[PDB]
């Protein structure tokens, strides 16, 4: 039974190492969510600092890949940083060679192709991570593109990743069934972050403090993460209505 | 490390057999029967396509009979994809020889080269062998008309009439029975088709389940012509010989 140890086909036509890499994805027990506004793309993720000895500022699963592109990861931090460093290098090389900033969907495809190679070549293992890329692309506008260990990728109106993804997914599905549009009809990113946090609270059924969340925001020509005080301001506005 | 997963394709059994070569030959025994018959005035190549469909575009299809150069052709039995890798290599060798010596490559030299490539995969590299057996039909000014066969071991032999693929035991007995040395091409054409008609696992031998070819000095004066038969021409020769 060595067809379960390396990336070769089982009699069922299945790659078990790919399937087990998907299971490693939920090892952190963290749930992430991404949504699109008019002028922005917002990504939120649960922040859990269990040890009091940890420096909480260094505990992060959101990465600044380029000036425009941001990436949140669902999976263990070593594989997350492996993917982050590579995506950064790929985005920088792209700009040098082709003279313009790497689009979010192109980066997602490139990282997905790299992931595909690990599912075919035996010596390389898959990374146990799901990479959600976000930006405000200069051609396509607000963008969410997600990659997994199978090498699969696709664009999203909105998306959710983690142990309780299905609850978040269905919550988001129902909202977009009402509004009948592909985005959050809102001018300011501040309110789109408030929407994201609110709908995660409803889906998960848990309340959040400023240190329980981690937020990333993509606007035209820059991506940035919110501080604990920026999130606190966000939580105050939610509670006051 | 990686050793754990190595099948070790290039090793002897306790009996002194090459496992993978033997299993590749087992694979080839399930392939469509290909027959070659050498006559005094030409060579015949006849081969059976494997359980085809009515929607298969036959006139543009090629799975059995391939052209290496103007003088040499091959009949394939086994993995088609593997055969095409080797065929392109053989086509290049023929052209290299032509460029170097300004003369068309002698048939045996081409056969040896391909057979040596197959041999290499059984002795070194750790890769699986090519699951292919060829029948080489060709002509040169030294030995004239020649029939050879090679198999995954890289061993090749010369023949007057030979079969590869499925039911070779039954086919070779029938050829051994009706073959004679003074035979001609038109007679060999009939023998090849009659042999396939009896050994076939299909209910009846039809034009859409066959590929056919002849290498003839039946070309205007001292020169050789290859003829890859078209679907309509295979249908005509089946009626002529009295099979359909």
């Amino acid at each position: 039974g060595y067809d379960r140890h390396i990336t070769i086909f089982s009699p069922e036509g299945r790659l078990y190492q790919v399937e087990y890499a998907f299971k490693a994805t939920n090892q952190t027990n963290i749930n992430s969510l991404a949504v699109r506004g008019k002028d922005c793309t917002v990504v939120i993720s649960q922040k859990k600092v269990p040890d009091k000895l940890l420096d909480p500022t260094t505990v992060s699963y959101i990465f600044c890949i380029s000036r425009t592109i941001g990436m949140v990861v669902n999976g263990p931090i070593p594989d997350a940083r492996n993917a982050a460093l590579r995506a950064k290098a790929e985005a920088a090389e792209f700009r040098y060679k082709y003279g313009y900033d790497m689009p979010c969907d192109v980066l997602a495809k490139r990282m997905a192709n790299l992931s595909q190679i690990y599912t075919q070549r035996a010596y390389m293992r898959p990374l146990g991570v799901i990479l959600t890329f976000v930006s405000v692309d200069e051609e396509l506008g607000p963008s969410i593109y997600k990659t997994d260990p199978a090498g699969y990728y696709v664009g999203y109106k909105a998306t959710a990743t983690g142990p309780k993804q299905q609850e978040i997914t269905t919550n988001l599905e129902n909202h977009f069934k009402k509004s009948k549009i592909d985005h959050i009809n809102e001018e300011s990113w501040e309110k789109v972050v408030e929407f994201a946090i609110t709908h995660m609270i409803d889906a998960l059924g848990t309340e959040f403090s400023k240190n329980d969340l981690e937020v990333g925001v993509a606007t035209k020509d820059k991506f940035f993460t919110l501080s604990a005080e920026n999130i606190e301001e966000r939580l105050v506005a939610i509670a006051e209505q | 490390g990686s050793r754990r997963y190595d099948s070790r394709t290039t090793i002897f059994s306790p009996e002194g057999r090459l496992y993978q070569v033997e299993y590749a030959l087992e694979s080839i025994s399930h392939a469509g029967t290909a027959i070659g018959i050498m006559a005094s005035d030409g060579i015949v190549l006849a081969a059976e396509r494997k359980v085809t469909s009515t929607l298969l575009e036959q006139d543009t299809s090629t799975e059995k009979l391939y052209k290496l150069n103007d003088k040499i052709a091959v009949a394939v039995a086994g993995l088609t994809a593997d055969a095409e890798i080797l065929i392109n290599t053989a086509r290049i060798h023929a052209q290299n020889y032509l460029k170097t010596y300004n003369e068309d490559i002698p048939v045996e030299i081409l056969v040896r080269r391909l057979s040596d490539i197959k041999q290499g995969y059984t002795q070194h590299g750790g890769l699986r062998p090519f699951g292919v057996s060829f029948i080489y039909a060709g002509y040169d000014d030294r030995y004239g008309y020649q029939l050879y066969t090679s198999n995954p071991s890289g061993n090749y032999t010369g023949w007057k009439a030979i079969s590869v693929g499925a039911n070779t035991s039954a086919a070779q007995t029938l050829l051994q029975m009706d073959y004679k040395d003074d035979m001609k091409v038109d007679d060999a054409i009939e023998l090849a088709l009659k042999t396939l008609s009896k050994t076939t696992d299909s209910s009846a031998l039809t034009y859409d389940r066959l590929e056919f070819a002849t290498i003839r000095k039946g070309a205007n004066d001292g020169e050789v012509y290859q003829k890859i038969f078209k679907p309509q021409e295979i249908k005509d020769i089946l009626v002529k010989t009295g099979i359909t």
Binding site: F9, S10, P11, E12, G13, R14, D105, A112, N113, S115, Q116, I117, T119, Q120, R121, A122, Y123, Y145, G151, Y152, V154, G155, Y156, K157, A158, T159, T169, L172, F176, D182 | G1, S2, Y5, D6, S7, T9, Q20, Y23, A24, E26, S27, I28, S29, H30, T54, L55, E57, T60, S61, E63, L79, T80, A81, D82, E84, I85, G126, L127, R128, P129
Partner: protein
Amino acid sequence: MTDRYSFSLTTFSPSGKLGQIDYALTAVKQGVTSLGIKATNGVVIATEKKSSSPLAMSETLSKVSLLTPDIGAVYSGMGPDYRVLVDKSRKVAHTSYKRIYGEYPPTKLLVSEVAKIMQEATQSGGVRPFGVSLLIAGHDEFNGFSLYQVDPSGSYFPWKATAIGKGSVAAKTFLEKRWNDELELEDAIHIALLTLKESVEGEFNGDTIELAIIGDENPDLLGYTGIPTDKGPRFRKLTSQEINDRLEAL
């Protein structure tokens, strides 16, 4: 480090079976149904856009891909394996042909190059076979319209019409009854939509179906004027609206 898997992972079993190729074909069998039909003045390839989630934008995922201006491809099996094959197929069309002969390759030769790549993954060291079956439709000046199937083994066959994947056995039987050598492109598109409806469970419309054709030259899609010999691509992906129009006359 170093890739220490320099040995074949696909090997002949005692029965003469290449296990990994058979298992790759099993993966193709599980895949979503795709099909191809050749007409007298064109070819049509079609498949179902099986959306993994309704939040996902299925337009961003292209199952039908342009390889050259006159050649298109569709698959059944593992999507990621298909995506990298399309990338390699597009590149090999340039490196091993266009940069040599100054023109795009004919369908059969590009198919041959793709097949070679798939064969090598069946014999080379430290790799598994590709888990896809391709259907490549195309046109060229001297061979005309053609349709080819390519399997994980690297074997390829030319077809008048065929289907691969989930409901291929039933679909091929359906195509055998309908196909003839006097079909026009519009008739083939009509048959394609009929055939594809049988294998689809849920929604059946232009947004859940991907369909492209190899047909007449499209000078409107060329992007420039001034060179008479350049008349535009024969490959054209049908829009969501164009599909729905023909579903009313279904």
